[PDB]
Amino acid sequence: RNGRDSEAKRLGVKRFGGESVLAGSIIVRQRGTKFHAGANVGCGRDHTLFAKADGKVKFEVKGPKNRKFISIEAE
Amino acid sequence: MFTINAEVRKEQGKGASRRLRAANKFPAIIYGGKEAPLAIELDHDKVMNMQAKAEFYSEVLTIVVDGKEIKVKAQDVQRHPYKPKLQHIDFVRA
Amino acid sequence: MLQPKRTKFRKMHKGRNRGLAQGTDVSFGSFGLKAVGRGRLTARQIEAARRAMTRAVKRQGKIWIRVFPDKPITEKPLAVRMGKGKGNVEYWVALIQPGKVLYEMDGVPEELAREAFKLAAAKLPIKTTFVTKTVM
Amino acid sequence: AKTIKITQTRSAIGRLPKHKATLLGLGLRRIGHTVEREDTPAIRGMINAVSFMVKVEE
Amino acid sequence: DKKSARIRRATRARRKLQELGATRLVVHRTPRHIYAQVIAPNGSEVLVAASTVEKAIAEQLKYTGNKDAAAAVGKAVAERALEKGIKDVSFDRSGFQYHGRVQALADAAREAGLQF
RNA sequence: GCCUGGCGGCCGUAGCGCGGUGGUCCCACCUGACCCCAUGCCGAACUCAGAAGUGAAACGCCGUAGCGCCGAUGGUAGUGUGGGGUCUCCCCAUGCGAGAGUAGGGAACUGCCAGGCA
RNA sequence: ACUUACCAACCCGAUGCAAACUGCGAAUACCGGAGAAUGUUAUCACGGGAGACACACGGCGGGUGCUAACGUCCGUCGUGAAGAGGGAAACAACCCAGACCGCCAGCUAAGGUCCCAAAGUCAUGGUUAAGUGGGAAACGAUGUGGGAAGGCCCAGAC
RNA sequence: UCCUCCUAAAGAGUAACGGAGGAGCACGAAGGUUGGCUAAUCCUGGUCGGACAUCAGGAGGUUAGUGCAAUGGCAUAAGCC
RNA sequence: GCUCAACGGAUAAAAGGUACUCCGGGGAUAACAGGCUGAUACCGCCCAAGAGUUCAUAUCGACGGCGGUGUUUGGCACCU
C-alpha cells in the first residue's frame, strides 16, 4: 500500500553569507518565502531568490514579523 | 539554625562537578541581593541528613564560607533522579 | 488495559530509550513507586500492577497511574518471512527511563504503601524503588 | 620565536582523515619523529587536534 | 480603525518605492489641512515640506482643506523642490484615493515642474 | 524646553489589561451633500463643501507589573575527539554547552521635518 | 415544572508522550573569506589505457526484525578485500602496527612477567574464599569489608 | 512514471516488498493590472426559522481561505470583491 | 498523431505445457542435513489474587514477571 516518494528537489541555500555573487546567481532555491527578498535580490516565480546585482550575500532579520531578508551589498 | 560549612569552587563545568560528586560533595550557588553570585561546594552527607528535616526549606540557613557567614535560604534543589542524593542547591540570600 | 483512544498514525518507529526521566517528583499523591531500571512497560503490566495495588490497600486510598502507554509495538506472525511490510500492532508500551514515578498513592499509611508497592513492583519488568513526597 | 618541538607517539593507521591531514600539517611522518615548529595558536590548534598521538615539549 | 486601514492601504506602494529607491512625495490629507513632504530614498530624512499649517500658505487661502488649498500646497512643494535641485520624484498618495484634493495637489505639482 | 502631526530606524525590556488626563493650535469625532466622486441597498465607507459642538469614542500622554516579553550565575541534558565498562545503555579525560527554571529586569529608546505654546 | 450515588464539553491549575508536533535549540558537519606553518601539486582541466558496478565485518546514527541472527537495508568512519608482523589459546574483518634487502645489535606499542613460554613467584595498602576469578537474570539470604545517621541503654537496655 | 511528508544522522543527497498520502488535470477567467476589503467559530437580540440558511451587535484572532494531496508559504496578502 | 503506464519507450504486430525433456551455469539461490538466532516450543523459577470446610504456598495456582535448553514450528541464507 506504500512504497512511493518523489524525487528530491535540491532546495536550500546555494550561496551563504558573505559569499560573493554575480548578478543572476540563485541564492536560495526554496518553497514558500521562508527567506524574503531584500535589497538587490529578486524573487522568482517559484520563490527562488536570485542576485539582481553583484556583491556579497547578506542574511538579515527585519521588520515587525521578524522575517529573514536577504540583501546584497554592492561589492 | 543550620550552619553549613562550605568552600569556594575554583573549578566549574560538568567535568569538575561530576569529579566533585564522586568525592562525596556537591556544588551549590549563593545568588540574590546585589552581590555577585558565589559558587560554593558543600559536603554531601551533612546537607542530606540536614534536609531530611522540613525546617531546611523554610528557616533561614547560615553558610560559613572562608570564615564568613551568609544568611541564605534554600531556593531550589536539583536532586539525583533515582538515588537519594543531591545534585545542586540554589541558595537565595536573606 | 490502557491505550490511546485515537491515534494519528498506527505504526511508530522503534527509536531508542536514552537519558533520564521527566516525571521525577511525587506530584499528585504522597507516596510513589519510582523506576530505577530502564525498560519499557506494556499495558498489561500496568494493569496487573494496578490491580495488585488496588487489592492491596483496599478500596480506600487514591492511586495515580503517572505513565501511559501510547506507543504501538508491532509483531510479525509465526512462519512469515522477513520483509513484505511492517508487522501488526499487537500491544502498547510506555517507554520508561530511570527516574519515572510510575505510580502514586495517597490516603494510606506509609506501611501499606510499602506493602502495595512491593506487591505491585513484582508484576513489572524494571527495578523499582519507593519514594515519598519531598517538599522542594 | 619560541619553536615548540613536537613528536609523534602513536601510529596513524586507523585514524580519521582529518587527523592524518593534521599530522601532515605538522609534518610528522612516522612514530618518534621529532619536528620543531613555531609556537603560534594555529600550530597549537593542530597539536590540540591530535593531542592523543603527539607528545609536545617546550 | 480608519487610520490603520489607511496605513495598510499605503503599505504596498510605500515598500515598493523603498524597494526601487526613489525620492517620494508623501501627501497627507486631513479634514482641514493637506500636508506634503519630499522624502529622501533612505526614507528617514525629509528634504522639502509644505502644508496648509504654514502661515506663508495659509494666509493667502480662504479655507485650508479644500482643492484650492491643496493646489497651493502642490505649487509650493514643486517650487521649493526645484529650488533644492530635486527634479524627479515618485508620488506616494499614502493610502488616499488619487481623486480629490490629492489629485489637485499632484496636478499642481506637475504643472509647476516636478517630474512624475 | 513642553505638546501635536507626518515619514523612518527598531521589532514585545517596545504588546496587552486596569486607572487618570488633553484640546489655543494639531488630531479625531463632527456639520451638510445639489455639485467632483461613491454605495452589488445606504454620503456607513469613499469623496466634496465646511466649523457650529464635544473630547464621549478614537488617538496621544502620564501612572499602575495582573499577564505577555527579556533574562543571568550555577547545575543538568546533549555532543566533537581519545579511552573504558557490567556495553539495546553508560562512564572517564578533554573541547563546546543548551532548553526549561531561578534571582532579577521590565510598562521602551531614537532620527529628520513641520506647526502650536513658553 | 420537581429530584438525582452517573458521565462530561469549554476554561483554569498541576503531570507525562510524539518519525510524519515546535512559541526553543546545541555539538558536529557544510559553504564562503583572511592568515601562518607543513605537504614530492597533494588541486583543477584536457587527452591515452583501464578495471569495477556480488562486497564483508567492526564503532557511531538509524529503518526493518523480537533493540533476534555471522539477519537485512541505509548514512559515516576504520579494517579486510588488496596488508604481512605482535597480541586476543587457535580466530579475514577486533587491539597494536603498516614488511625494499641484510645483521646470533638496541628501545618500545598492544599485551604481558610462577612453569609450559621471553620477562616481577616485585614493593606498599586493601578486598574475596566462592577456585569467585575462569558463563547466565528476576528474586532470596544474620556471608563479609567500608560510610553516614537513628531508637533504646549501667534511674540497668537486647 | 510523476508530486508531498517522515526515515534522512540541523547544507545537498541517501536504501528496503519501510511508514503515510496524492497526480495522469482544471481555468479565457480561477490569467494581467488597477482600486478596495478581511476570516473560522462562539455568545446575545431578532417574523416564519429549526442545532445550523438571512439581519444586527459583541467576543475572537486567521483555529479561516488558498480549483484538487501534503509540506513550505501568504495580511504589503499568495485569501475575498 | 502513443495508459509506447513494464512510463530512457526491444517489434507496426505475440499466450501456454513439459514427470518425455535437454544444455550452460549457481551453493550468487530453494528443498534435506549442519551453522547463527530463540519469536515460538519445552523445562525451571519470582509475586501471590484465589480454590483447597478453616488455611495462599499438602496439591493447584489467575493477572503479571525472570531465565534455561537447543528437543518443535520458524527466521536468516554462512557450508555443500
From Swiss-Prot, chain A:
Any one Gene Ontology molecular-function term assigned to this protein's record: rRNA binding
One of the GO biological process terms: cytoplasmic translation
PROSITE patterns, alphabetized: RIBOSOMAL_L27
Source organism superkingdom: Bacteria
One cellular component (GO) term of this entry: cytosolic large ribosomal subunit
InterPro entries per the UniProt record, alphabetical: Ribosomal_bL27, Ribosomal_bL27_CS
Alphabetic keyword roster: Ribonucleoprotein, Ribosomal protein, RNA-binding, rRNA-binding, tRNA-binding
Subunit structure comment from the entry: Part of the 50S ribosomal subunit. Cross-links to the 23S rRNA. Cross-links to the A and P site tRNAs.
Family: Belongs to the bacterial ribosomal protein bL27 family.
Protein name (database record): Large ribosomal subunit protein bL27
Species annotation: Escherichia coli (strain K12)
UniProtKB/Swiss-Prot annotation, chain B:
GO biological process: cytoplasmic translation; negative regulation of translation; response to radiation; ribosomal large subunit assembly; translation
InterPro entries tied to this protein: Rbsml_bL25/Gln-tRNA_synth_N, Ribosomal_bL25/Gln-tRNA_synth, Ribosomal_bL25_short, Ribosomal_L25_dom, Ribosomal_uL5_bac-type
The family this protein is said to belong to: Belongs to the bacterial ribosomal protein bL25 family.
Annotated GO MF terms: 5S rRNA binding; structural constituent of ribosome
GO CC annotations on file: cytoplasm; cytosol; cytosolic large ribosomal subunit
Name of the protein in its database record: Large ribosomal subunit protein bL25
Subunit structure: Part of the 50S ribosomal subunit; part of the 5S rRNA/L5/L18/L25 subcomplex. Contacts the 5S rRNA.
Swiss-Prot record, chain D:
Entry-linked InterPro entries: Ribo_uL30_ferredoxin-like_sf (IPR036919), Ribosomal_uL30_bac-type (IPR005996), Ribosomal_uL30_CS (IPR018038), Ribosomal_uL30_ferredoxin-like (IPR016082)
GO biological process: one example: ribosomal large subunit assembly
Residues spanning the signal sequence: none
Any one of the GO CC terms: cytoplasm
Keyword vocabulary terms for this entry: Ribonucleoprotein, Ribosomal protein
Molecular-function annotations in GO: structural constituent of ribosome
Subunit structure: Part of the 50S ribosomal subunit.
UniProt family annotation: Belongs to the universal ribosomal protein uL30 family.
Additional detail: This protein is located near the guanosine triphosphatase center of the 50S subunit.
NCBIfam families to which the protein is assigned, alphabetical: rpmD_bact
Protein known as: Large ribosomal subunit protein uL30
Organism for this UniProt entry: Escherichia coli (strain K12)
Curated annotation (Swiss-Prot), chain E:
Domain of life per record: Bacteria
Domain remark from Swiss-Prot or TrEMBL: The basic N-terminus is not necessary for binding to 5S rRNA. It is however required for cooperative binding of L5 and L18 to 5S rRNA as well as for binding of the 5S rRNA/L5/L18 complex to the 23S rRNA.
Protein name (record): Large ribosomal subunit protein uL18
UniProt entry tagged with the keyword Endoplasmic reticulum: no
GO MF annotation list: 5S rRNA binding; structural constituent of ribosome
Sequence similarity: Belongs to the universal ribosomal protein uL18 family.
Lineage of the species this protein comes from: Bacteria, Pseudomonadati, Pseudomonadota, Gammaproteobacteria, Enterobacterales
Cellular component per GO, a single term: cytosolic large ribosomal subunit
Organism for this UniProt entry: Escherichia coli (strain K12)
Disulfide bonds: none
Keywords annotated in UniProt: Phosphoprotein, Ribonucleoprotein, Ribosomal protein, RNA-binding, rRNA-binding
Gene3D superfamilies tied to this protein: 3.30.420.100
SUPFAM superfamilies in UniProt: Translational machinery components
Entry function: This is one of the proteins that mediates the attachment of the 5S rRNA subcomplex onto the large ribosomal subunit where it forms part of the central protuberance. Binds stably to 5S rRNA; increases binding abilities of L5 in a cooperative fashion; both proteins together confer 23S rRNA binding. The 5S rRNA and some of its associated proteins might help stabilize positioning of ribosome-bound tRNAs.
InterPro entries: Ribosomal_uL18_bac-type, Ribosomal_uL18_bac/euk
PANTHER family: 39S RIBOSOMAL PROTEIN L18, MITOCHONDRIAL, LARGE RIBOSOMAL SUBUNIT PROTEIN UL18M
Biological process per Gene Ontology, one example term: cytoplasmic translation
Keyword Magnesium set for record: no
